[PDB]
């Protein structure tokens, strides 16, 4: 049948799912690895052992162990990101959406969820790949990877918890797609990896990583990049935090093995309950366990790799959302409220910058303040808010990506940059938050197409062209089908606005502030 | 007679001069000190010793030995600032304009010319004090002081060349005014000292210095203040420079005694010719020999005196001109010319900020650049030109004045701040230069009132109200006339920080003069540079 597929490791039986008064095939919860439980906790994934019989891929798998958000219980805007399935260490599964009739060696798109490496699920309602696969006729895969300590505890030197294993999970899911997507009507030579946040960062790490380069054709990065300040740590910092987790759980710390064996004896939630205590500073947009520059997965420093062109040369399509910082200020910065205009005083502004730039010294904090403060009206609450909404957004998302984009374009084969500034009419978050980190995703996955989700007519149309650009990029390496989205070049540095209005072409995306973040501030801090 | 006066030192015979269809009394070239010549070069000024008979005070005196500007020979715009009389080390004299008939005991205004402490004359056409004295009915004094090495050679520890002697020269003219202005109809209890550029910095230095404090009542500072980066140097830097000056003239350098004796044998021009060779860096708006923070004229750092309120508390009126830097970039920065729009390329901009901020390190230069660059349009010549202009004007004049006003106001008894942004219709300099450094002076001294100098009717009006605000400030301590229908120049307070524009348009009140950039120059950069 159309739902029965013979794979390299075994047989799989999918399910027919309805989509916009039609149908397509879905293959949910296919294992690409051996459950990383028990003795296998913190270790490099192992390929899934073949199975006899038929595997039931009609329902979503379990979600990986993660810190669940409870800031706003019941509230949809936050819960839509929380796990919607039972959590388990047995969570290394992938989802495939296959149009009907099954295509022949067609375009493949792999989704990598984000959530700062500490959280994330492949089963979220907004990651439902049926609308994208059906509308664009692409085979859509959504993978999963260990997060938090479970995927990134890094004690460099030991083979028990070497680090980056969460990234290695992603890579084995990619290998699986490579060895098996052909059986589903997908061309393994035309694979596009795409994601947002830590998932967009992930994408970039695979472009950098030699061991991952050959497992995909192109890349799409959404509001994230490898060089982000929160996306990685040195081996010594990784070890520092891993030791700090042991100290927090009263573990023996004489040796790595002794410490690792102790962390394995602990129940999943026990680790999760002390996860944030290892962070060196009181901050926002900083996550405990993330990728490490170990010399293995990543040969040298991200920067030196980027300067020397030591990375996969291909076409990339990436971009940022207008208000990346607002989600992080609401959760951790004083003055910010989900139920108010969140006007910030000068005092809450000073402390807000200290929370956004944790590594900077006093001179550094003065530079940031001087850069984002209007001194003729320094007590304007809106300006202090919007101004703080830029620091976190420029520092953590926009400027890192623009540094990436400009370093990549020097050796690459084609870059396409976007700025997403449309605020969804049915948004549940307050107006001061603007176009929030992660709210382009519902447009990339075509949710505006399902009418009972109450999107405007022009939002569905905006969703349809974002999807077409995505898919058309995936298929040809150019989002344009023969108003054009122009190529980003180091001379022109062109990009487009991604909204309901007729496409407009701009230049030098936030160059003023990004010259500060990528060049001046780093130089200052190094010198001081 | 109205023109013959019995001063404390001796008799003086003035001259009757015409002014706008009327007449006034003028006493030019009156000596207030012994000529600082021979073995008296570099030494503190001594009082003029009494004379018998009448002193002919009917003609301007000699200008002090200074570097003459020969960038544009014959050009009125630059030569109007050059010496207009013979140069001589015998230059310590002062000029007085007295209304006729003589007033009883009226308001006194003393002018201290500027010119980076290296140049300047009391005799320039723009300093003709007849118009202001006749028009505002005040007694106008014009003084002189030793400039360059002559008035500021500083070998600290030595009593032959202790430094600050040019400032001391000023103070003696001031003491003279105090001991003798009453005979001319002036009130020694009501003297306002005012000056532009190094003259405004001089005024502020007398506000800070304990020995000059009681010689005046009020103060006016124009386009200059005491803490300006170019206005003073440490005793070390003063000593280094005086040694480098000896080294440039093959002098014996074993002791201050031998070094000073060597320089006293040199002809005046011999010193002037190497004067600029002693500066630390290639730069603009930096002068060689200037006031030294000696611990005598200045008890402690200007900043600590400002912080602890160790200064004369009175009323001050001060302000700045829209484009304070253009004059300096034209003379020493590549790309700038008086025969073109002076559009500056990105390269010429980078080298420009280096010449402008000579003391800053690489990181410092980068901060300055980042602060004044429009990165979306960084190849714009107009923007690079204006950008550079503002750098030089904010750094050297405006922000150090804002720092000063802001500090003084916490202790003062009245502060009135102005922003002069009127471009004179008959200006001789190019359009890009804007409202140049020194060009409000002609309005202060009422030049626009002499119809044959070709100013517009509205320019004569501006000049009248500027002179009136100045005079009324000198008389009352408030530029505004009580219960007058005219708009009002509001007080500058630390909380409100108000100031007015000074032009032909109806007055406007603004707040926090160039804060953004001044927070950078006065607060951030100094910290940045301190961290190193
Ligand atoms: C497409 As998401 C990378 C699951 C939306 C933003 O999520 C942030 C976040 C930021 C600030 C407060 C809470 C959260 N959150 O609950 O997910 C992060 F970092 F978790 F991903
Ligand atoms: C014991 As906590 C008060 C969940 C440590 C920091 O928490 C942040 C936060 C919360 C949710 C997602 C990301 C972040 N962060 O990156 O800092 C905030 F916002 F609560 F303070
Ligand atoms: C009221 As004046 C202080 C005698 C005019 C500007 O003078 C400047 C200056 C600035 C740049 C180029 C040339 C000159 N100049 O010839 O006097 C200086 F040097 F006197 F301060
Ligand atoms: C031996 As030279 C070329 C007279 C020292 C610097 O010269 C300045 C300058 C020259 C004349 C008056 C004022 C200035 N200044 O204030 O910097 C500049 F700008 F020409 F280079
Ligand atoms: C035919 C078959 O074996 N498929 C099973 C199905 O019967 C069951 O309802 C589903 C959900 O638990 O799991 C799968
Ligand atoms: C935008 C860009 O860089 N495209 C290049 C293209 O010019 C070249 O023909 C091709 C093969 O080498 O590689 C890619
Ligand atoms: C008599 C006398 O000494 N006074 C003269 C005066 O007559 C002359 O006009 C002026 C110009 O030199 O010098 C003085
Ligand atoms: C603006 C200002 O500070 N003026 C003060 C005034 O209020 C005070 O009455 C007077 C006498 O002490 O000193 C001066
Ligand atoms: Cl081990």
Cα–Cα distances in Å, from A392 out to A114, A230, A286, A385?
A: 17, 11, 11, 11
**Residues B143, B45: Cα–Cα separation, whole Å:** 14
Test site for ligand 1: of A115, A272, A438, A442, most ligand atoms within 8 A of the Cβ: A115
* Cα Rg of chain B (Å, integer): 22
The reply to whether residue B363 touches residue A527, judged by beta carbons under 8 angstroms, is yes
Q: Is A223 a catalytic residue?
A: no
Using CB atoms, which residue from B370, B374, B527 is nearest to A516? B370
Distance in angstroms between the alpha carbons of the first and the last residue of chain B: 67
The reply to whether residue A511 touches residue B376, judged by beta carbons under 8 angstroms, is yes
The DSSP symbol for B17 reads E
Number of Cβ atoms within 10 Å of the Cβ of A428: 12
**Residues A304, A323: Cα–Cα separation, whole Å:** 30
**Residues B201, B197: Cα–Cα separation, whole Å:** 6
| DSSP string over B333-395 | STT--TTS-----HHHHHHHHHHHSTT--HHHHHHHHHHT--TTSTT-HHHHHHHHHHHHHII
Buried b (16+ CB within 10 A) or exposed e, A127-152: bbbbbbbbbbebbbbbbbbbbbbbbb
Query: Please, after which residues is chain A broken with C–N above 2.5 Å?
Result: 482
Name the structure determination technique. X-ray
Non-local (6+) Cβ contacts of B283 within 8 A are B332, B355, B356, B358
Non-local (6+) Cβ contacts of A290 within 8 A are A116, A117, A152, A198, A230, A231, A232, A233
Ligand 8 lined by B477 (C-beta under 6 Å): no
Maximum Cα–Cα distance across chain B: 73
Distance in angstroms between the alpha carbons of the first and the last residue of chain A: 67
Q: Give B269 to chain A, closest Cα distance, Å.
A: 46
**Residues A472, A465: Cα–Cα separation, whole Å:** 10
Dihedral-angle region of residue A38 (phi above 0 means left; psi in -120 to 50 means alpha; beta otherwise): left
- Closest to B113 measured CA to CA, from B75, B78, B85, B146: B146
Q: Which residues of B touch A520 (CB under 8 A)?
A: 366-367, 370
Handedness of CA A401, A406, A412, A414 (dihedral sign): positive
The reply to whether residue A524 touches residue B519, judged by beta carbons under 8 angstroms, is no
Buried b (16+ CB within 10 A) or exposed e, B45-59: beebeeeeeebebee
| DSSP string over B409-447 | TTT-S-EEEEEE----TT--S-GGG-S-TT-SHHHHTTG
* Cα Rg of chain A (Å, integer): 22
**Residues B45, B151: Cα–Cα separation, whole Å:** 10
**Residues A49, B337: Cα–Cα separation, whole Å:** 80
The CATH class of A1-528 is alpha beta
The answer, yes or no, to whether the previous bond of A448 is cis (omega within 30 of 0) is no
Q: And the tokens for B479? A: 């530029």
The answer, yes or no, to whether the previous bond of A101 is cis (omega within 30 of 0) is yes
Only one residue has tokens 């940022």, namely A320
The reply to whether residue B363 touches residue A523, judged by beta carbons under 8 angstroms, is yes
Q: Are strands A415-420 and A316-321 parallel, antiparallel or unpaired?
A: parallel
Torsion angle of the four alpha carbons B287, B289, B293, B298, in this order, in degrees rounded to the nearest 10: -100
Q: Give B530 to chain A, closest Cα distance, Å.
A: 10
**Phi, psi for residue B349 in degrees, rounded to 5:** -75, -45
Q: Which residues of A touch B515 (CB under 8 A)?
A: 375-376
Torsion angle of the four alpha carbons A50, A51, A55, A57, in this order, in degrees rounded to the nearest 10: -20
**Residues A294, A209: Cα–Cα separation, whole Å:** 11
| DSSP string over B301-316 | -HHHHHHTT-S--S-E
**Residues B182, B188: Cα–Cα separation, whole Å:** 6
Give me the count of residues in chain B.
532
Q: Identify the active-site residue in A437, A440, A459, A463.
A: A437
Q: How far is the CA of A257 from the centre of ligand 4 (A)?
A: 72
**How is domain B1-532 classified at the architecture level of CATH?**
3-Layer(aba) Sandwich (3.40)
Residue B82 in contact with residue B111, Cβ under 8 Å?
A: no
Sheet with strand A415-420: strands edge to edge: A15-18, A23-31, A93-98, A139-142, A106-112, A186-196, A218-222, A316-321, A415-420, A494-497, A505-507
Q: Which of A383, A524, A526 to mutate to test the interface with B (most CBs of B within 10 A)?
A: A524
Give me the half-sphere count of Cα atoms (radius 13 Å) on the Cβ side of residue A95.
Answer: 26
Q: Is A501 a catalytic residue?
A: no
Only one residue has tokens 């993330």, namely A290
Q: Which residues of B touch A523 (CB under 8 A)?
A: 363, 366
Residue B48 in contact with residue B32, Cβ under 8 Å?
A: yes
3-class DSSP state for residue A49?
coil
Residue A313 in contact with residue A217, Cβ under 8 Å?
A: no
Maximum Cα–Cα distance across chain A: 73
Using CB atoms, which residue from B374, B519, B531 is nearest to A375? B519
Residue B183 in contact with residue B104, Cβ under 8 Å?
A: no
Beta bridge partners of A24: A17
* Helix (H) and strand (E) counts in chain B: 18, 14
Residue A114 in contact with residue A143, Cβ under 8 Å?
A: no
Q: Is A197 a catalytic residue?
A: yes
**Phi, psi for residue A436 in degrees, rounded to 5:** -75, 145
The domain ranges of chain B are: 1-532
Q: How far is the CA of A13 from the centre of ligand 5 (A)?
A: 10
The DSSP symbol for B33 reads B
**Residues A415, A417: Cα–Cα separation, whole Å:** 7
Q: Give B531 to chain A, closest Cα distance, Å.
A: 7
**Residues A440, A438: Cα–Cα separation, whole Å:** 6
Give me the count of residues in chain A.
528
Q: How far is the CA of A63 from the centre of ligand 7 (A)?
A: 107
Interface of B with A (CB under 8 A): 363, 366-367, 370, 374-376, 511-512, 515-516, 519-520, 524, 527-528, 531-532
Only one residue has tokens 């953004």, namely B516
Non-local (6+) Cβ contacts of B98 within 8 A are B14, B24, B25, B26, B27, B133, B139, B184, B185, B186
Note the Cα A362 to chain centre separation in Å. 31
**Residues B122, A386: Cα–Cα separation, whole Å:** 55
> Does an H or E element contain B177, and which?
helix B165-180
Q: And the tokens for B370? A: 């980042």
């Amino acid at each position: 049948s159309e739902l029965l597929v013979n794979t390299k490791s075994g047989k799989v039986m999918g399910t027919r799912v309805p989509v916009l008064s039609s149908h397509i095939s879905a293959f949910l919860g296919i294992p690409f690895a051996e459950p990383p439980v028990g003795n296998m906790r913190f270790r490099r994934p192992e390929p899934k052992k073949p199975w006899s019989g038929v595997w039931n891929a009609s329902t979503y798998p379990n979600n990986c162990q993660q810190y669940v958000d409870e800031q706003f219980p019941g509230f949809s805007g936050s819960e839509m990101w929380n796990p919607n399935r039972e959590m388990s260490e047995d969570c290394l599964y992938l989802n495939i959406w296959v149009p009907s009739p099954r295509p022949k060696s067609t375009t493949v798109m792999v989704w990598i969820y984000g959530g700062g490496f500490y959280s994330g699920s492949s089963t979220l309602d907004v990651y439902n790949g049926k609308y994208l696969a059906y509308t664009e006729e692409v085979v859509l895969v959504s993978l999963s990877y260990r997060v938090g300590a479970f995927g990134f505890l890094a004690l460099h030197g030991s083979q028990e918890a070497p680090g980056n294993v969460g990234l290695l999970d992603q890579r084995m899911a990619l290998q699986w797609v490579h060895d098996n997507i052909q059986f589903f009507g997908g061309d393994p030579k035309t694979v596009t990896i795409f994601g947002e946040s830590a998932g967009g960062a992930s994408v970039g790490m695979h472009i950098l990583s030699p061991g991952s380069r050959d497992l995909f054709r192109r890349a799409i990065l959404q509001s994230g990049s490898p060089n982000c300040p929160w996306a990685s740590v040195s081996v010594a910092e990784g070890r520092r935090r891993a030791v700090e987790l042991g100290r927090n759980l009263n573990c023996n710390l004489n040796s790595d093995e002794e410490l690792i064996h102790c962390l394995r004896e602990k129940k999943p939630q026990e680790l999760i309950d002390v996860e944030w205590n290892v962070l060196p500073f009181d901050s926002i947009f900083r996550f405990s366990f993330v990728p490490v520059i170990d010399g293995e997965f990543f040969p040298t420093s991200l920067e030196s790799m980027l300067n020397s062109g030591n990375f996969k040369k291909t076409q990339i399509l990436l971009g940022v959302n207008k208000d990346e910082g607002s989600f992080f200020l609401l959760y951790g910065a004083p003055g910010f409220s989900k139920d108010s205009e969140s006007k910030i005083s000068r005092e809450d502004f000073m402390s807000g910058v200290k929370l956004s730039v944790p590594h900077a010294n006093d001179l550094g904090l003065d530079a940031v303040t001087l850069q984002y403060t209007d001194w003729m009206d320094d007590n304007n609450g809106i300006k202090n808010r919007d101004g703080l909404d830029d620091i976190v957004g420029d520092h953590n998302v926009i400027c890192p990506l623009m540094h990436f984009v400009n370093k990549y374009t020097k050796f690459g084969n084609g870059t396409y940059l976007y700025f997403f500034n449309h605020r969804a009419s049915n948004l549940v978050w307050p107006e001061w938050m603007g176009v929030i980190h992660g709210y382009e995703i519902e447009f990339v996955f075509g949710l505006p197409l399902v009418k009972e989700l109450n999107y405007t007519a022009e939002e569905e149309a905006l969703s349809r062209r974002i999807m077409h650009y995505w898919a058309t990029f995936a298929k040809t390496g150019n989002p344009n089908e023969p108003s054009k989205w122009p190529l980003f070049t180091t001379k022109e540095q062109k990009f487009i606005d991604l909204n309901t209005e007729p496409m407009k072409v701009h230049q030098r995306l936030r160059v003023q502030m990004c010259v500060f973040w990528n060049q001046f501030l780093p130089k200052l801090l190094n010198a001081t």
